[PDB]
Design an enzyme around this catalytic site. Structure first.
Site, PDB file in Angstrom:
ATOM      1  N   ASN A   1      25.728  47.530  44.507  1.00 39.84           N
ATOM      2  CA  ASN A   1      24.531  47.906  44.985  1.00 39.84           C
ATOM      3  C   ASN A   1      23.552  47.922  43.958  1.00 39.84           C
ATOM      4  O   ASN A   1      23.632  48.517  42.870  1.00 39.84           O
ATOM      5  CB  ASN A   1      24.618  49.329  45.639  1.00 39.84           C
ATOM      6  CG  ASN A   1      25.330  49.501  46.877  1.00 39.84           C
ATOM      7  OD1 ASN A   1      26.330  50.342  46.986  1.00 39.84           O
ATOM      8  ND2 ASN A   1      25.066  48.441  47.846  1.00 39.84           N
TER       9      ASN A   1
ATOM     10  N   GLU B   1      23.353  42.617  47.559  1.00 41.37           N
ATOM     11  CA  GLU B   1      24.234  42.005  46.795  1.00 41.37           C
ATOM     12  C   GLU B   1      23.835  40.834  45.972  1.00 41.37           C
ATOM     13  O   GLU B   1      22.727  40.342  46.597  1.00 41.37           O
ATOM     14  CB  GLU B   1      25.491  41.673  47.560  1.00 41.37           C
ATOM     15  CG  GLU B   1      25.208  40.826  48.758  1.00 41.37           C
ATOM     16  CD  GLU B   1      25.869  41.150  50.156  1.00 41.37           C
ATOM     17  OE1 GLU B   1      27.187  41.354  49.880  1.00 41.37           O
ATOM     18  OE2 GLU B   1      25.425  41.471  51.115  1.00 41.37           O
TER      19      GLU B   1
ATOM     20  N   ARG C   1      11.862  53.862  40.930  1.00 39.75           N
ATOM     21  CA  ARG C   1      11.147  54.371  39.903  1.00 39.75           C
ATOM     22  C   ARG C   1      11.883  55.200  38.607  1.00 39.75           C
ATOM     23  O   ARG C   1      12.698  55.954  39.085  1.00 39.75           O
ATOM     24  CB  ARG C   1       9.851  55.238  40.238  1.00 39.75           C
ATOM     25  CG  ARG C   1      10.379  56.416  40.953  1.00 39.75           C
ATOM     26  CD  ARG C   1       8.963  57.477  41.336  1.00 39.75           C
ATOM     27  NE  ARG C   1       9.251  58.736  41.611  1.00 39.75           N
ATOM     28  CZ  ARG C   1       8.809  59.179  42.706  1.00 39.75           C
ATOM     29  NH1 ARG C   1       8.265  58.633  43.633  1.00 39.75           N
ATOM     30  NH2 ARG C   1       9.201  60.565  42.896  1.00 39.75           N
TER      31      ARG C   1
ATOM     32  N   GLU D   1       3.182  55.767  45.202  1.00 37.42           N
ATOM     33  CA  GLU D   1       4.128  55.100  46.338  1.00 37.42           C
ATOM     34  C   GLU D   1       3.217  54.049  47.037  1.00 37.42           C
ATOM     35  O   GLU D   1       2.061  54.014  47.102  1.00 37.42           O
ATOM     36  CB  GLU D   1       4.613  56.289  47.008  1.00 37.42           C
ATOM     37  CG  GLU D   1       5.683  57.174  46.575  1.00 37.42           C
ATOM     38  CD  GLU D   1       6.030  58.483  47.165  1.00 37.42           C
ATOM     39  OE1 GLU D   1       4.940  58.855  48.203  1.00 37.42           O
ATOM     40  OE2 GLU D   1       7.214  58.931  47.075  1.00 37.42           O
TER      41      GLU D   1
END
Ligand code: NA
Ligand code: NA
Ligand code: NA
Ligand SMILES: [Zn+2]
Ligand SMILES: [Zn+2]
Lengths: 57, 471, 461, 468, 48
Positions: free
Chosen positions: C161, C210, C166, C261
């Site tokens: 993964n 992936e 952050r 964000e």
């Protein structure tokens, strides 16, 4: 030769090409439509004119 | 930068990579129209296209002169990459800056008098006329500045579609010319002609001024001096009519008159909403004299589905005076973007003085002389949002619009027939969208602290621009 | 049209006029952050900014690598002026090219593995760390690709993964990471790569995850990877500028944030996890690739735009072939613009309904605009034209209360719930009556050929 | 269960007390339609009515074959008193099963090839045609399965298309059909061959009546409805690319007449009103094959409910449910039995706040639900959507009309809905009758009276004691 | 209209006859007393 918009036979040659013999411009005296010798104008059904339609304008 | 004619502006565009020269001979139809459409389609930095050779014709054609923000900025004499917001601010600063009367020049000093045609008038011997769109009623002059009136400073200049009806005759919608609207009754009642002038290939700001919304009463040669930051423009008396004055630098000048009591089919032709107009009976103008520069350039405009050149010609032309009207009564307004279909869509950026004030700003816009019948969708955003940056406006919409309370729909409002979605036709159901942050006493469901830009951002913007200029 | 590292892509950017070199020395704050903000603020053709000298540091910084459609196009190996719609189509084409497993190469062949630091780890001796935004809790690594193994199959580098999170610097060899953003109960190795191939960062910012997907994104060309130095089940890109191998410290929660964000606001400061850096592996003279984020649009918006639009488009197209394109590029798809063919009267609202019942569209999409097949949903000027000429607000604007929402939208009331807005900006089709039908100014014959010819003439002048 | 033809099903219906034989001779015009209407009006255990003798006709007629939940249950091989919800779940089970390709048999084996009429083709010598409704524009064939090939892959008998089409008898060997409702991509570039089958196995009619939006109008689908047992088909006598059921009572081979439009209608349709009289296509009948002593199986339709409603109820409900279920596993059931799905009741678990309206959106974007469904009611997972008084309880306790009723205009509509304005366009109405779930606030939480323990066992016990 | 025809005669027995109009394709049995409601009856104008 007939007009491509209203079908009238009253079509008059407007001008010749100023340079050479490349094309001619034709104009209908009844509905003012004009077109060039080198173009193949197909008027859309909604844009064709008739005496009944010109009278409404 | 100040331009005395169209030629210096084309030179400036060419030096800035904003003008493509087509050297191979092209056919009048549909090459010129297709190239105008493609130029408009290039995305950003869209250039003007110059046709050096058109089969059967003697002279050149230039199109899409105004069709970009780069060309717009260069028209205003600013760096070609000036932001849309900054161009809006420069235009607002110059809009009322100076009352400046145009300088009258002698006939021998006007390049538009270099050649005169008096008897065997043939528009095709000068302009390489072509068909702009497939279903147009004929060959059109789509970017002309028409001059009508005993004073050369109470003259009216505007843009009107000009359909070629004969080598010497042409068509016009005198119903859209108020100065002609009053004089047409008295002229046709005495079968006395009505003088008129048609100028083609002008300094970009003259075309700009001719396109300014008629309501704002800025369609005079004096306004051109205003737009040039106080520098006047040169005008020359018409050869045949002593009360009509035309720009000295115009490529082609058609002096003529409206034929009295004549009416005939004009159209169809494209219109700024992106569709064909109808064919209607309109007026006809006979051309009595043609004065033109040596090797005249036919500056013509393509229009189709937006955005094309005409959208740029109208964008800040509509935005700036709307902003002035809003600002007079509501100083919190920062900017007004009315660039979408002649102001049918409007985005106002303002400070919210207190809870609900954004809808008040929208109400004020919906009660201005132009916004009342035209503006159908009004978005209001906060003062730090750039209303000309549509990505930012989308951000404001997505994070600040609660459709249950921030989207107001009002039926039975003033409309305009040019909007085809109106039902009933000519009536508007207005839509206000409040995309500002809640301000007391409006409850805020979740207060957040925005990521304010770091210090020195403006200095770094200038620095990076200077570093990019070296590549 | 394929990059093996960040440096090759940077040279492509420079050769195409999309990279600025700041030769002069700059201060860590706020010059780097403010220059990221300025570069984003340039609006069009925004370049990447490369700082060669930062006061007190030994290596260089690069920012805004993805912050333009020109940069985005060059990342995909296309002409820098390719339209956003055409990039959408190309990405959609490559999206499903599954069988591209990555190539494993030896340690001696990985540029990543040139220099190794295994004692007295000091992040500040490699990365010129700086504060991105004023109220940030600290210096941040905002563009790293984090690699972790899947607990379902721990030792299978084909089931790893990769993602972006952050990373706050808490000490010279300790950073902060967001915990809940399975194995965290039982026990943790982790790798943090910085300065990667742009398509690797693209894959990391996509919610698959992936290296095989990067291979698909490169039109079937597989990417190269290497085993971590301390963890045999962790594999990192072979061309990474910097690789941090480390582990999560168990039973430790420290204050993390605040940090910006993508909706344009600061997050709160919350108790999060801490990672200890056990080893640093990097190329000689490494380049710190970092990202600025503030009020949109900034670079992260380009990292999220088309890899959000493409999956939604595929889902819509499965049941609705008339859909031409989906533009879900605004705040992670809270605003969507769908270009579709209208099969019959009312079909546009049906397309909107289908989008509003997809796994992502249902909670996220709040404003859904539907336009005709010929309107470019990525060209907001054309969309404004569609709204102004096609929308009758009395019939074409539907407001639906009591719908799924998302807390990330600050304007939701009740929070996390939506009142959806559907705007049908399409032309009526039978049996819908038309108040007055108009003939559109169809483009002249030969327009596309003339586009090509004009581009060619411009390139030669 | 499997049926080789209609007669097998009629035998099952007769042995279950679900078939009435009319031995006395009856008149064509009033009697047959009135008997269909009466059988529907019985309201419960409505039987199929078999007319043995008709005035002036040699052969017999049967109606209301599908016209009850008892007949529906027997068609699926269930106990004839199985509930509608249980029948829904049974059909949902079978819809999944692998579709077995139909079995092709030789002409000598098909009962539908026993007799062939090729010269003096006259529909009246075989089918006792009558008038279904007083204002109908003529005599009608209302329950036929029409077989057409698709020119995308025209040589595959597994790609054939079978549908239900209104057939208006126009002449001895000429009938009418709504081509635009079938025969469109293949007609503009054109005769077009057609087969019209009458008197089939009930599952054949059921498959032919499945809404076209699901692409389930193939013979192999019957193999799924028969639990993996294929059906028998034969080649057309005239067209080598058309295949018809082996045990059909009557088969009509023919073709669509090119460049011919005739006034068709009016004909009573499922909303309980007459349709308009519009210009439609004609079909020339070229050859008739039929079984010895053929039975004309015809359908009456009037004000709901009639046989058409039973033929369509679960036929519409199950595919809608499966389409929703693909992406929304929380959906428990879909009841779309009301006027071909104009009214829909979906029962589902609410995953998070607002999910109910999302389920409604998904239904309103399905191929059938998008133009048809006008009123969509969503209820909690425990509410039985086939129990209308339970749905009313959900409406009265859960619907807050200020936020749970959503009216969406300018949506795709249905032309046979008489209230549409503009005609053919819909204003959809979504009604959320589910309990709020986080993050939606709950104005007052309640604890429902959950059923006592042992309720299911006691249901079985009470049924057993009832049987005595 | 007047352009009617006898489409069919009754099979076994002689009990009825089916007549049909050749202009609008309307049909009826000889034993019917039909009354085409005013909303249903059609003229040449409506056919066009
Ligand atoms: Na608000
Ligand atoms: Na519409
Ligand atoms: Na609710
Ligand atoms: Zn004409
Ligand atoms: Zn008749």
């Amino acid at each position: 030769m007939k007009c491509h918009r209203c079908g009238s036979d009253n079509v008059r040659k407007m001008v010749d090409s100023p340079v050479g013999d490349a094309w001619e411009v034709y104009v209908c005296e009844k509905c003012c439509y004009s077109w060039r010798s080198t173009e193949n104008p197909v008027v859309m059904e909604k844009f064709k004119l008739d005496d009944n339609k010109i009278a409404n304008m | 930068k100040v331009y005395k004619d169209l030629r210096e502006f084309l030179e400036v565009l060419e030096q800035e990579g904003q003008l493509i020269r087509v050297k191979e001979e092209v056919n009048p139809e549909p090459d010129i129209a297709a190239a105008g459409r493609a130029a408009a389609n290039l995305g950003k930095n869209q250039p003007a296209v110059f046709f050096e050779k058109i089969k059967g014709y003697k002279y050149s054609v230039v199109t899409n002169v105004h069709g970009s923000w780069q060309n717009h900025a260069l028209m205003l004499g600013l760096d070609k990459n000036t932001s849309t917001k900054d161009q809006f601010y420069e235009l607002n600063r110059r809009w009322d800056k100076f009352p400046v009367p145009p300088n009258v020049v002698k006939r021998e000093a006007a390049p538009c008098k270099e050649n005169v045609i008096d008897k065997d008038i043939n528009l095709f011997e000068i302009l390489p006329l072509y068909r702009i769109n497939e279903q147009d009623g004929g060959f059109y002059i789509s970017k002309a500045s028409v001059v009508t009136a005993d004073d050369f400073n109470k003259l009216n200049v505007g843009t009107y579609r000009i359909q070629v009806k004969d080598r010497d005759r042409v068509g016009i919608q005198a119903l859209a010319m108020h100065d002609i609207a009053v004089q047409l009754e008295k002229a046709e009642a005495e079968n006395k002609p009505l003088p008129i002038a048609i100028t083609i290939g002008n300094n970009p700001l003259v075309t700009f001024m001719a396109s300014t919304p008629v309501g704002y009463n800025q369609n005079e040669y004096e306004f051109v001096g205003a737009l040039q930051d106080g520098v006047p423009m040169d005008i020359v008396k018409s050869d045949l009519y002593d009360h009509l004055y035309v720009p000295a630098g115009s490529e082609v000048v058609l002096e003529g008159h409206i034929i009295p009591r004549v009416r005939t089919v004009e159209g169809p032709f494209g219109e700024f909403p992106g569709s064909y107009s109808g064919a209607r009976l309109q007026c006809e103008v006979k051309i009595d004299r043609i004065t033109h520069r040596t090797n005249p350039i036919f500056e013509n405009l393509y229009l189709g589905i937006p955005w094309t050149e005409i959208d740029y010609l109208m964008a800040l032309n509509t935005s700036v005076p709307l902003y002035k009207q809003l600002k007079e009564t509501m100083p919190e307004v920062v900017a007004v973007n009315a660039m979408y279909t002649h102001g049918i869509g409007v985005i106002i950026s303002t400070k919210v003085r207190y809870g609900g004030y954004a809808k008040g700003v929208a109400f004020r816009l919906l009660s201005t002389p132009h916004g009342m019948p035209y503006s159908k969708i009004v978005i209001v955003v906060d003062e730090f949002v750039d209303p000309f940056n549509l990505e930012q406006v989308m951000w404001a919409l997505t994070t600040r619009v609660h459709p249950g309370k921030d989207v107001s729909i009002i039926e039975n409002c003033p409309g305009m027939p040019l909007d085809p979605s109106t039902n009933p036709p000519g009536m508007h159901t207005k839509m206000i969208i409040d995309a500002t942050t809640p301000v007391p006493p409006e409850p805020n469901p979740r207060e957040t602290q925005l990521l304010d830009p770091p210090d020195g951002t403006e200095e770094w913007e200038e620095k990076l621009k200077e570093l990019l200029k070296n590549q």
